[PDB]
Amino acid sequence: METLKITVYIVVTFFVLLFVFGFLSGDPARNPKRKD
Amino acid sequence: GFAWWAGNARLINLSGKLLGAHVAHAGLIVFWAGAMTLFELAHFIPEKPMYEQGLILIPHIATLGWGVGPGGEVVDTFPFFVVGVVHLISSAVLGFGGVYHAIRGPETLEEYSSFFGYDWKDKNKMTTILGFHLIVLGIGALLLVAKAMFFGGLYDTWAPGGGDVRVITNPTLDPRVIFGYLLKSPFGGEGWIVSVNNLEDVVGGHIWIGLICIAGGIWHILTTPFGWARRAFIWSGEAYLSYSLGALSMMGFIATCFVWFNNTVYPSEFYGPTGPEASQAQAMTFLIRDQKLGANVGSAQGPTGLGKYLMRSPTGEIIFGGETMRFWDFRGPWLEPLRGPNGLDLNKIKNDIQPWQERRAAEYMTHAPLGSLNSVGGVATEINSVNFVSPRSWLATSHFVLAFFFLVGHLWHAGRARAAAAGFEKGIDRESEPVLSMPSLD
Amino acid sequence: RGWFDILDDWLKRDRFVFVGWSGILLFPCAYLALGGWLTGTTFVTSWYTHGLASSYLEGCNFLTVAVSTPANSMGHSLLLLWGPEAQGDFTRWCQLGGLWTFIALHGAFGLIGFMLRQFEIARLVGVRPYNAIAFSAPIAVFVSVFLIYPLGQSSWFFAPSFGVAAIFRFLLFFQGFHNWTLNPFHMMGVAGVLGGALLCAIHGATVENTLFQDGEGASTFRAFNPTQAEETYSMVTANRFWSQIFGIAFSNKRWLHFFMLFVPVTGLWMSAIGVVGLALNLRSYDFISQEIRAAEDPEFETFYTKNLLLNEGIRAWMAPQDQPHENFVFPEEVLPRGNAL
Amino acid sequence: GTTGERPFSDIITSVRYWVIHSITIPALFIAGWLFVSTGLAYDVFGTPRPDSYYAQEQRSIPLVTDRFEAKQQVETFLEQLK
Amino acid sequence: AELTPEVLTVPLNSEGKTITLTEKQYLEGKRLFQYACASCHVGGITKTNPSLDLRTETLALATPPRDNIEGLVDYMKNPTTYDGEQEIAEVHPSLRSADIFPKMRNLTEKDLVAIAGHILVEPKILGDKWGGGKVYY
Amino acid sequence: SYPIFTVRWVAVHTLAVPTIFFLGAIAAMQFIQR
Amino acid sequence: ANLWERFCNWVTSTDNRLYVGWFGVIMIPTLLAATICFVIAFIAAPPVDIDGIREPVSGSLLYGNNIITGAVVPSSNAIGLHFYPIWEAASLDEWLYNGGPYQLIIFHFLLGASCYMGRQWELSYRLGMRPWICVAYSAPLASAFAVFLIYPIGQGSFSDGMPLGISGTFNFMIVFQAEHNILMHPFHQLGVAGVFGGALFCAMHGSLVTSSLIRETTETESANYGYKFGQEEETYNIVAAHGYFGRLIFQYASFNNSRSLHFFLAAWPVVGVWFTALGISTMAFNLNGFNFNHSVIDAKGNVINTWADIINRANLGMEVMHERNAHNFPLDLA
Ligand code: CLA
Ligand code: CLA
Ligand code: CLA
Ligand code: CLA
Ligand code: CLA
Ligand code: HEC
Ligand SMILES: CC1=C(/C=C/C(C)=C/C=C/C(C)=C/C=C/C=C(C)/C=C/C=C(C)/C=C/C2=C(C)CCCC2(C)C)C(C)(C)CCC1
Ligand SMILES: CC1=C(/C=C/C(C)=C/C=C/C(C)=C/C=C/C=C(C)/C=C/C=C(C)/C=C/C2=C(C)CCCC2(C)C)C(C)(C)CCC1
Ligand SMILES: CC1=C(/C=C/C(C)=C/C=C/C(C)=C/C=C/C=C(C)/C=C/C=C(C)/C=C/C2=C(C)CCCC2(C)C)C(C)(C)CCC1
Ligand SMILES: CCCCCCCCCCCCCCCCCC(=O)O
Ligand SMILES: [Cl-]
């Protein structure tokens, strides 16, 4: 069960970091009109 | 180019009139706080529990240690009057400045003075205004600490002998404790910051927060946002509003759970018992009645095979049986004397229940936070007779509704701020429709 | 010009409230149905038919007033004012439940009048008659619930009474006695109603968030002109959005708006059929396989068996007061009850 | 755009309109008031007054139980209160 | 039907003397019963001990009999268990325990008679509903 | 000129006249005591 | 050319058949977890002790349910609001008995649906659209939070959240009415007006546009072929639609502005469903529907029943029978 707990913690951390860093990667600029 | 129904958007770039709107609105808030307190006092009867009387502001004052003595008995109503008068008087000053700045004062402030004027897109000026308000907030948190430590203390429902006003001499400073709350699970038996159950932690948390806010205020006066923050945010008044709406929404949902579960900074003496509390108190009440009649409550097997009065929680603690099995995380000053290391202690139950505990359980069971919209107390099938809706239900429901609508407002304004910043909030340019210049999906 | 044609001319004049030939049926019947309800909910009791107060005069509020059904003893009497029950006495007619049949029957002919008006105006203006066709759904619901349903039962007593709480009681009756939530025809009605509200919301939002910038204002309503030929929003961008969000999207505006007609109208028609079955107590009450197992296996429990216990509670606890003509006397000891409650 | 009747906003801001209706509206209100305060509403519709639902030592409902004698049953019940 | 003096006539004591309340007393009694008692005794039951109700026949079998004004007024001063063997002022509102039940502090002797009269009149009006519980709602 | 009495005038008063009457009757009811 | 920026460009690409986006990075795994667990539990989960009284309720098909009766059963009342992930059970057998899957499914689902809403904002921004479709979806989303999260929080137990099943849903509705008199609560009445009105206006709008399609086809072909995707001209005559609807009622009760019309279509059901979601969310804290029980009494004090007292009799029958083995004490305080 502890192996399972660790795996999920790692998987969740990974996706959440993708989310946080993705939106920090200049998201306002990713539109089709004004990019600033 | 806004219509009348969006008319306050016409103020976005009129710093002077917008200041008046804010200050006049602030007057409305302080006016309600004063008028409502005086209304509550005019109706207050000292012989009735606060929570039979529809009071929500007097409980907040009492909780700060004003007007009450042991057990929560009201001893002096004058502090309540004072609080209401001073707020009411103060609202005329705010109303005066508000209507002056909204109607007569400079429409824009940028010309009258570079200090008070601002451009939404001026990241330095915006973080400086933020810094000032953070310092103000930090001072406000330290006022609570001042009250608790130097000016009479706070009401402590956990005080020995029924609850009392108590000066806090050793506030909790250990950051493992203070920030440990911020890391507890929000689920049952843990309760995130809602589980704070003693005034030492309450006051120490406000020392920390006061210092944190002052330090961060100084930080933001002195800095400009770093590039990574510049590129992550929208910098516009509507964007800033949307950020604050999200924060207020979050705070309102938290406040909702605080008043529903916490009986420390919302003492049940004033607010009535929590839902869990009342449910536990019912089981206590019938345990008491039945034991007095001769029942052996520890060995009484109920219809399901589980104990009728007592059973184990999933981790083994001895807890009240029946449906209140769900509420065994409840902790309250009338009940903890019966708790041993393994949970409820059968020998204390048999030997040490006191009349005041019997009274309090009976009182709380019959003042559970259930009632109709027209203030008929009890379950939905009850007949008319008792005029009662718990202050906890009033405060929980109202703040859930407000928090929900502010999240909607966050989404509304955050989406609009993004679209306006990129230039397509009024619709798609017929001659430059983005999708018409994209490849088809299939 | 013959007299008939001159009356046609007058009936069909463009005025603030169009009249038409349909108006001769619609306007008296609608006003009488509406006036009967207001009259009865303000002044008339249900004491002699139901043992209930039901008017403002008696102390009821907007939620509890009703024009209640006639007594079960009236059967399916038309309860005409001049009929054999009231014998022309207006007061007794009120006390016997005559306003119920008055409202229901005038209401029915008013509904016919209204659908005829939809036909009449559509023919005069030159449009297709789909709004009339759509309105068949409200008609089917009205006749099936207010007329067919009580006609299969013992009397008008068991029709819905015209009131907010009285309809609430009707809902609960249908749960406890008919297990109406388990009925696939009601389920199809639920899907068409909830599906319609979804379509309404999602179509309006889509249009409002795919608008073309046709003016400089921040209030986008001003940049529409009822005679412009151009579409005011982008079907193309709408289709791309929904295709990428949900997988599929509309591409055909005609199909889209026909579908919007189809979904709620069909759902209502389906629920009406189920109510026709309940007129005969032809319920979807049970699953036989479940009952056989549960009778034999006392450890077998499902949400289906749990809900039948609730129905059983509803029936025994509401019947004596809800059906006073039956003179049900249930001693305390026969009421089904769980532990403690 | 218009069918020739007089615009409502023109009517209800007019002096003559309010000369008439400052009488007719309160008059109708008072008529309806009196319809109740005199007790006439009770008698017209047959609605029990607060003292007329039950006889003094009675907790039985006067429920109509015949179709063709219903008129007489109601009358029988009312005389049990005189 | 109406609130006649016959219905407002209740036993004053165990010796058969009676007293006729006014409508004023009865309504006062009702209001005060709601103020001080209904939270536990709504409808003539007892939420914290349902085995004991406010039905007249139950009160008649209490020791001291409580189916009369005197017995009820005394009960409000000095409550006992149903067999009279133990005084229960510390867990039941009474004038003796107005320190711990503050709603009893501002009750006058006349208020006590009114409450007692309401308790005795209401079963005459409501029948089995008084004390019978949800079965009769 | 504008006509005074129209079909519209009738439809309006068919509803407004009894509405005010009923409103007065329902007002009086708030003072009925049992 | 940098790996992270190419990943960022694929995540936010408007060229993917289904848009992913940053909200999608959370939505996809959480919806797949909820969906896969749901399908497996619905088919094969063993019986669950929903009310914590060692009285397991069979919810899955292989244990004797059909599609109508089957459910994923809520987690045990013994757990209450405690977090019960798999790794907290001594075994999967234990986790299944106590209703673990319910928790996994609803938490993953609520997270995924939240991200679905954000994803709707996100693609609207990438496409240069206006942003508020996601605000329309907040009405159904709020309603799911109410029955899966807020109501359990207020009552203290996920065992009183809505079951994931057709008959389980009806059970939840009936119990709710007995304990909260939801029918007599104005926010639910507004929900009905939002949903009945939404269905009404759906049919109205569909029938008025359908009534005024411009003749572009013959009697032998579907009229739908008279519209071609992306054509610039409107396909119906809104002035004729208004000319019909304004006469059906009167002129000023009919829209001639298509923008106001479609805004109204959006706003009526969204706002109604917000209220009904707030209804459930505030009855979660036991601020219940109006109680007019015995509100009408006669000169002597006899109760004169109204239709509200009849509702009450029905509510009582629901109250006294529900969870018939679970109460030992006389008030069902949660
Ligand atoms: C807290 C609520 C609030 C506040 C504080 C404001 C404030 C403001 N509004 Mg907004 N507004 C609001 C609600 C509010 N509004 C609502 C609910 C609507 C929808 C109807 C609008 C619609 C709206 C529109 C359409 C417009 C504004 C505008 C304005 C600004 C100029 C108004 C002006 O000159 O009026 C002049 C009005 C008067 C001279 C009449 C008297 C007003 C006074 C202040 C009443 C004060 C009474 C009080 C008892 C005095 C106490 C005095 C004592 C303290 C000494 C002002 C800052 C305008 C704007 O942005 O200008 C560019 C504008 O065009 N508002
Ligand atoms: C945050 C709110 C706020 C802000 C940002 C401003 C900002 C401004 N005001 Mg406005 N004003 C406000 C509130 C506000 N005012 C209020 C509440 C009132 C009513 C009393 C007024 C009445 C007012 C008038 C009559 C005038 C201005 C003017 C001005 C300008 C110059 C101010 C100056 O030189 O003072 C410099 C600094 C001081 C004088 C020091 C004052 C120190 C304060 C009073 C102490 C802090 C108070 C504390 C928080 C309250 C304690 C709580 C208590 C209830 C127990 C500036 C744009 C002037 C203007 O625009 O001219 C065109 C002008 O003529 N203001
Ligand atoms: C009203 C309060 C407030 C506001 C609106 C801001 C706003 C800002 N701050 Mg300041 N700040 C404040 C208070 C505040 N600050 C205080 C009190 C301090 C002292 C500690 C600071 C210290 C501070 C520093 C040191 C820095 C900022 C920076 C910034 C900017 C970027 C913030 C950002 O990206 O956040 C978004 C947040 C993140 C990207 C990280 C998230 C981390 C949290 C803890 C995760 C938790 C999420 C979870 C779901 C919620 C539960 C809470 C959990 C801990 C229990 C922005 C202008 C930055 C800047 O540009 O400075 C010039 C910067 O480097 N702030
Ligand atoms: C701090 C809070 C805050 C602030 C400062 C603003 C500020 C603004 N909003 Mg945002 N808004 C908020 C919260 C806030 N909003 C919330 C919580 C929501 C979600 C409900 C919204 C939803 C929203 C929309 C949908 C829109 C705005 C718009 C606007 C702009 C013009 C608004 C205006 O003139 O209103 C004028 C005020 C009125 C027309 C009055 C509305 C009356 C309300 C709906 C009824 C209140 C009754 C209350 C419940 C009690 C009744 C009880 C009983 C009597 C029955 C302005 C920039 C507009 C915009 O985008 O401009 C940029 C716009 O279209 N707002
Ligand atoms: C469109 C108009 C309309 C329609 C369709 C109805 C329909 C109805 N009404 Mg309503 N009614 C209306 C207008 C209408 N009413 C108006 C304007 C009023 C106000 C006065 C009323 C007041 C009213 C009351 C008070 C009652 C009804 C009732 C009824 C029902 C029975 C009608 C019946 O038996 O007719 C029978 C009559 C006909 C069908 C007429 C046929 C014409 C014949 C063929 C010609 C006769 C030839 C002649 C006698 C020979 C002349 C020879 C000469 C030399 C002697 C039915 C639902 C009853 C009801 O609702 O029951 C619950 C009831 O009690 N109506
Ligand atoms: C709960 C906090 C109560 C309140 C408030 C009031 N009463 Fe009570 N009452 C309560 C209990 C638990 C009991 C049983 C006591 C016992 O152990 O025997 C009672 C009993 C009574 C009785 C006697 C009933 C009988 O003998 O059949 C009476 C007459 C009575 N209580 C009256 C009463 C009055 C007048 C109250 C308002 C002043 C009142 N009670 C409040 C619980 C509670
Ligand atoms: C701008 C604007 C607006 C707003 C406004 C506002 C919001 C205002 C405010 C204002 C205010 C906010 C005000 C206040 C005032 C107050 C006052 C003026 C007070 C007074 C007081 C007194 C006088 C007192 C007395 C007393 C005492 C002392 C004691 C006790 C008793 C008594 C209570 C008697 C509006 C929207 C409308 C419109 C547009 C514009
Ligand atoms: C007083 C008190 C206390 C204390 C407290 C404290 C100490 C607290 C703290 C708190 C805190 C410390 C908090 C924090 C918060 C945070 C948050 C809330 C954040 C958020 C974030 C965000 C929102 C982000 C977003 C984003 C992303 C993610 C990406 C990019 C973009 C953006 C930026 C948008 C206690 C309990 C002891 C007790 C009692 C009292
Ligand atoms: C039956 C009958 C008849 C007829 C009758 C009639 C036709 C009547 C009518 C009546 C009417 C016609 C009535 C009316 C009434 C009305 C009312 C009563 C109203 C009310 C209203 C209100 C209350 C409202 C309110 C409000 C609200 C709530 C919100 C918004 C605003 C308002 C203000 C709207 C006859 C004779 C043939 C004979 C036989 C029988
Ligand atoms: C189709 C249009 C029908 C119009 C119906 C209008 C009805 C008005 C009739 C009112 C008259 C009632 C007189 C009662 C006399 C009865 C005598 C008897 O029953 O023997
Ligand atoms: Cl229980």
Author numbering:
A (entry chain I): 1 to 36
B (entry chain C): 32 to 473
C (entry chain D): 12 to 352
D (entry chain E): 3 to 84
E (entry chain V): 1 to 137
F (entry chain F): 12 to 45
G (entry chain A): 11 to 344
What text does the study give?
Light-driven oxidation of water to molecular oxygen is catalyzed by the oxygen-evolving complex (OEC) in Photosystem II (PS II). This multi-electron, multi-proton catalysis requires the transport of two water molecules to and four protons from the OEC. The OEC consists of a heteronuclear Mn4CaO5 cluster, which cycles through five intermediate S-states (S0 to S4) that correspond to the abstraction of four successive electrons from the OEC via a redox-active tyrosine residue (Yz). During one cycle of the catalytic reaction, the OEC consumes two water molecules; one is introduced into the cycle during the S2 → S3 transition and the second during the S3 → S0 transition.
A high-resolution 1.89 Å structure obtained by averaging all the S states and refining the data of various time points during the S2 to S3 transition has provided better visualization of the potential pathways for substrate water insertion and proton release. A high-resolution dataset was generated by merging more than one hundred thousand high-quality diffraction images collected at RT from PS II crystals in various illumination states and a structure was refined to a resolution of 1.89 Å. In this high-resolution structure, the waters in the O1 channel have higher B-factor values than waters within the O4 and Cl1 channels. The average B-factor values for the waters up to approximately 15 Å from the OEC in the O1 channel, O4 channel, and the Cl1 channel are around 38, 31, and 27 Å2 respectively. The waters with a high B-factor in the O1 channel are distributed through the entire channel, starting from the bulk waters (lumen side) to the waters close to the OEC. On the other hand, the waters within the Cl1 have high B-factor values only near the bulk at the lumen side (~33 Å2 on average). Furthermore, several Fo-Fc (difference density map) peaks in the high-resolution dataset likely imply partial occupancy of highly mobile waters in the channels. In the O1 channel, the Fo-Fc peaks are distributed through the entire channel, starting from the bulk waters (lumen side) to the waters close to O1 of the OEC. By contrast, the Fo-Fc peaks in the Cl1 and O4 channels appear only near the bulk water on the lumen side. The combined 1.89 Å high-resolution structure of PS II in this study helped model partially occupied waters in the crystal structures of the individual timepoint data.
